[PDB]
Amino acid sequence: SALAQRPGSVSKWVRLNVGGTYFLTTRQTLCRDPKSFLYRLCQADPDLDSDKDETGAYLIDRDPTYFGPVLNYLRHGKLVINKDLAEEGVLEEAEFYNITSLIKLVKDKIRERDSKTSQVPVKHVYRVLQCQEEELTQMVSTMSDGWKFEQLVSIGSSYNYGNEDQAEFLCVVSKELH
Amino acid sequence: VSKWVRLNVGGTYFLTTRQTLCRDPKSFLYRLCQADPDLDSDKDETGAYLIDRDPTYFGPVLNYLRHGKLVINKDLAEEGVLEEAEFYNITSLIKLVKDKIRERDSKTSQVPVKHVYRVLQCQEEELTQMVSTMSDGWKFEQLVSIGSSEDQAEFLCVVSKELH
Amino acid sequence: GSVSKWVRLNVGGTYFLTTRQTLCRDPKSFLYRLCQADPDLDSDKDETGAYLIDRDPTYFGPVLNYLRHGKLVINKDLAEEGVLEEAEFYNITSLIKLVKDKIRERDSKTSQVPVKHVYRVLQCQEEELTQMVSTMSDGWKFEQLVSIGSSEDQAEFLCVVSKELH
Amino acid sequence: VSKWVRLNVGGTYFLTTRQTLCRDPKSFLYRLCQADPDLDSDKDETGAYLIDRDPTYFGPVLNYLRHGKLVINKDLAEEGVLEEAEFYNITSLIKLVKDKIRERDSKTSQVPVKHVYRVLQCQEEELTQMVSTMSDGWKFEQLVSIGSSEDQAEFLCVVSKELH
Amino acid sequence: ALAQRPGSVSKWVRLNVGGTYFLTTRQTLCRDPKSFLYRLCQADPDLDSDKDETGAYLIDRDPTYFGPVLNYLRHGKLVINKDLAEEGVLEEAEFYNITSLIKLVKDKIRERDSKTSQVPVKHVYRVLQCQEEELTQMVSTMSDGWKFEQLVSIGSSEDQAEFLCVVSKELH
Q: Which residues of D touch E156 (CB under 8 A)?
């Protein structure tokens, strides 16, 4: 019944037993955000000397898989998620441990990808080129790079009017905008 | 008399508290929680309880029993979850697990987001203008004459939009 | 009337625990010899008790799952071809069927057949044109439309619309 | 020189039988199948042989030696297999993997699925029919009036078909 | 009591990176004299307290990104699997200070973000002209690779012609 704490109670290197798969990290990493459950470890908390085991690991009834990204964040202040981990189980772990900074960023991600699908795609831009027939072949083959043919449409077919008169063709052409 | 319980699930070991293995008291797991003299021999030398089931699927099961949510990693197949939910007898989860299966099954739809349309009208003079100026999201499908000889039309013109 | 219940497998390095009884679902399979406690494999047992098996464990999961619950559970990363080979070596006829249905299921899914279309020509005068196109039922896409004279009564326009047949 | 042999590729143990490692006698591994006096420093406490390489990619290789097939999990990089194949020197497997890599590279590059076209003809009355009764797989492209105000043709109508 | 450890004067070096043990040879870690690792390579005294109860040196970083690092060293080539986050490697490269790696790791991060290639693979366009009678023919005896686009009528009520016809062709 605690006479005093245990020889490792302040060690540099701390062993966590996050739900089964043991983790390794330096006590001081845990002192990054001083409102987290884990900040207790950082400060030698004597309430934890019954949730430590045989190896002197700290125990944690939570999911080792999801924990990683968290422990990394504490290590360098960055969000790392492999492409198969499910970000919501990262949220649930961010809350449980209580890392106010992180939780903001996870829920940023969660929107960022519910955004990522949402779009109206490729804001196409259109242009109406006009020419006579005598240069139709020309106008079509000498379009600019990237632009596509959408439609063209006659404007009067069956000889002219007088010693002058309106062009003869339109042509609408498009381009992407990625 | 320990708060903690080790589980040898198919081979790999799992750590968790007596407290988490009784959130649903009809389950198999509940007996462990209850310090049962009928699952004593099903412990190994290091103390764990032995459980002839694949663990890679037993993950999400144990998470639910912790925070009451469903957490499935993109690659893990739901169908393998369900079997473990049903083997362990955790009805509330099974409900959730079959809702995921119906959830993502119905996504085979090649049934697209319905395009709405509009039929614009303008004269020749403001046609180039009309086209280039075109508002946000609207694509161009076709235009047509109404004869280039009382206003009525000079040109008509169709255009589409997505509505997801 | 003995009950030596549990047994450890050293499949390819990574251990496995499963009950004697699980390994007696297909009595024509290699694993049935482990189940009967065969003296001819006492020298394929290491120190820790387990049975040595010179095969890939990443794929031996699905195979052992079938013998627990009689179903085919395959994660999306694991390639089914590897489940087949293991299924053959261990010799689980029932399973070798199931695994070979999966492959033909999927390796004939990647064959992408053109979508069929149904096509109709409507016909609507100028006034009621706008109305026609913007009201269209679900699925029906636009295709073309043509003036029939652009200038008595008749019909003013026609129009082709179309719809997937998935 | 027993029967069973333990490796230790990159710090994650492998188990296999002498017999699997003699398949190719011009590969590094072959020395571990004979019982080499000069690869006995590189044994550890557990008796296993030590190998400074990456055990992710080593699996496939070791598989090929057991049953002569190139099995790969979908996520893993073939380029990493190639490289581990080469190191160990299995000329058979380097060929199989350099097949796999050519087999899927330049995947995203098809010869332009050629198109064949027709030009259907009809009159006022059967118009609706011609379109509504179109052969399997042909697509609509364009239709044309021929002078709308003793019979002749009234409507000409182009149509395509993909040739996969 | 004898003399020395059947395994002290050893080529082999155990790391306990973030909690999952890695094995490698002294000769491997030394590939870049500038890196953090180069020190454990050379059995540094200012690290003899980051070793554990069984000889492996300790590193507070994430193994699941380490891998690639320890590979590049072994064989001077960048390997990452399709599911690992390329960004997370950059950090583990920058912490260890492997300069040649950090030029590669970033070049891949460009390489695939630098790949919105909706870049319209080009099309050349032509304008054909044929009468009514030989209008079915043109369309079908049309050359290899060309597609149809649109066609436009020219005056229905002298031999010349009666229809234009636009037709595309891809430029792969």
A: 146-147
